[PDB]
Design a protein around this ligand. Sequence first.
Ligand code: MG
Lengths: 104, 114, 55, 67, 98
Amino acid sequence: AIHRIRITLTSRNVKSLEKVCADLIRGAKEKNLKVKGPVRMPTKTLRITTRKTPCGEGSKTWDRFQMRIHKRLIDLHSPSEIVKQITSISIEPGVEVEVTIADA
Amino acid sequence: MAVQISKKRKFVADGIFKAELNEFLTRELAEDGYSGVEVRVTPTRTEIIILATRTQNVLGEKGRRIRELTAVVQKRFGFPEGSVELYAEKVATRGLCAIAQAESLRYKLLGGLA
Amino acid sequence: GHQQLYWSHPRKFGQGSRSCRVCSNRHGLIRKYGLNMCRQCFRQYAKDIGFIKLD
Amino acid sequence: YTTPKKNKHKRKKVKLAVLKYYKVDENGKISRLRRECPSDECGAGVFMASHFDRHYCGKCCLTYCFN
Amino acid sequence: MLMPKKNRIAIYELLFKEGVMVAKKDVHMPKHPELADKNVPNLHVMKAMQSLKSRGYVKEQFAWRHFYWYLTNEGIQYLRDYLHLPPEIVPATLRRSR
RNA sequence: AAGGGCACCACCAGGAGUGGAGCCUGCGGCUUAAUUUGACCAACACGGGAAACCUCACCCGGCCCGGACACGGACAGGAUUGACAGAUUGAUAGCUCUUUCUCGAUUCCGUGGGUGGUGGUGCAUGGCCGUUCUUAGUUGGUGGAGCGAUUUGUCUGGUUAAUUCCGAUAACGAACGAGACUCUGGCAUGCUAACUAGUUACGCGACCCCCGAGCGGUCGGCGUCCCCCAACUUCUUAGAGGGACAAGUGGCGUUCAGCCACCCGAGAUUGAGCAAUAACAGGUCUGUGAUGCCCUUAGAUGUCCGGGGCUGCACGCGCGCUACACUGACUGGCUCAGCGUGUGCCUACCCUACGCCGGCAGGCGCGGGUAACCCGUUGAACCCCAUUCGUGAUGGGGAUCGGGGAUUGCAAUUAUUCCCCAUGAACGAGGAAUUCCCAGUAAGUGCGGGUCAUAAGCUUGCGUUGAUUAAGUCCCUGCCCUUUGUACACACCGCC
Ligand SMILES: [Mg+2]
């Protein structure tokens, strides 16, 4: 086994996360695990504002940089065991995955 | 948990690692037709692919230089042993890489062409 | 001098304890998100980290 | 410039000759005429200094005072 | 450099065990990270590798705040006859599994 | 000089102001051992520059080589390195001296040669950035004209925010810029989905009415992803899509390009990012192991340590904060946010709930959070509702200054900051001048981030309350196109 696991995906782009959150749950449906829906956490917007010039002379122009971090949560729940069933990750570069159990 | 840092610091550190590795590879493989670096990280292990033009040149005598750089990137960032692998990849359409063309132009000017 | 005074002055805090992780500068550091990079070096490398301009 | 103090004289060592600060007598009878540093880090090999009012161990940096 | 044999040979055998060595540029670092048990300051290894660079047995690369010294073929036999080791033991980068 | 057009870094009509006072801060000047220095629309809260030490580059002193490598001397009968005591020193720097021990080939001396430098030169340079200029402008190929520099293309006109387009046409065909583009805001009771977001319903409770209601009212009280033991996605989140095109109607218009008005609509102009050719002796060599050349390199312009300085004041200026009060101050009560951060490679330094003590600043235990899980339903301020005050330099204002208590740190003096009790100064709306601005805008008002061991009168963002005036013009200051004049071309700050 009685296992209930959580898989979290996080990256900087939405295309890769969307296709992973698509193909993973599709593999789960074809491999008949009932799937808790993909939950989209609020986006983390890392903002860094910095003077453009390396000198301090100029017209006080500020360059603002953003990093967007997006993360999704998918809970895999089967009456049978899960880890011995699903082993493949199928993860492209640019996205980080973390798999925990309901205990942690 | 307490051992791992937050996601914000983690992504920033990953970007810093990419930038540091890119700077090192640029300063090291300058004459070897360096183009770029692509890192694929997994919890099991990580793979570093060096896009360049002269793969046979970046690889030393029987991979001596690629072994050297693998050990360097091993020690400088302190991965677990055997958890990083360095592959050298030949680029396609080297005329389309601005890095390779700029490096070749710099080499020509250093050689002494007008 | 010997080991007793060469580096004896405390630098456990303050502006003298921090330097840019790239250019070893002590001015205009960015410590947000543990970046620890100089103001100019962050502009230099910000494309590589992933800090990109949107607005 | 015009530094008020003169150029400080850096130390030059005394340029010591052969040590020979121990003697044996009547066809060999050992006489340690120097103090022995008893610590483990000094060991039983090195001798101590023979200053006019104390003894100094070169390695152990122990100073034994006799009053 | 006034650094003694007891850590000169330590640095040299570290450099010969694997074909490279990485050293952060910090003359005030109390201890070099690897060879943790030898009580060697970072300054000693930095100047030793600088001397090896000067004599030509190692080639030097400098990223942001790090040195990436690469041992050379002229370094092979100089380390070998410094350490009095037969030319059968090689650095790890030279020969692997062969 | 003319014609056409345009812009709140221009004006008009106005708003809030600044210039007046106190203070903070940045420049000049003065003084000083030093008050390090760059910069003079497009310098002066700018160098992310809020400096006790560090920073630091300046001043007064004191250490170390962290002078590779080559050569020659030197040496295990010792090249040479450290060090206790006394003086000496600011120093417990064996720095130096008296004094002897101790390391052992790593060094030491000399000659070349390094190396380092927040030293000089931004008028030798790269990169970046500012500006010209965010205006609509810019360029080839082939063809035409001209001996040629050049010109046409790139235009009379209409239109546009736009050389934007319709059209004319010795030009044709293109290219960049504009636009298109990306992010953002406003609409989706339509789709997907949620125990790190909820709503509704139900069931346990707690309290009021219980006269009698009772499917009565409140609950940010507890439960129903605890796995069988409710559903659903409106509200929150974030993806995929749609949605707006001058599309529909009327009028103007060459009835073209377009313009005005209205309906329906969430929306009929949401703000940003990027941003051409050519250039400036514009700024940075004090961001860089970007860098040429010069200077210095052992009594150092390298580096470290101690102290001081960067704050220093007859004075002038700039960016700001606080006010001059009753559209208010004080006291109490009630009631509302959104950005966004949070424990670290070196690197020590996190955000904090709750409980106890103290009057406050704070202190002490117990946790939570590497985070839509905890701070936190971020109980913010202004505002609102009541109290006192009463037109006075007053309960306005809080400068200056005395005494005392904590916190950070190795260290608080020239007061780091915070707290308490005392003093209550100028200031009664500010000359000549001058800045910014058109709708959720100005302004009032607080809250985050950066800087941060300690800290914001700064800056970058966020929300809350929320307007007056205007839908125009070339009058001033400027910009674009055409014609024109020129004795200018370093280009009217010209020339003479
Ligand atoms: Mg009062």
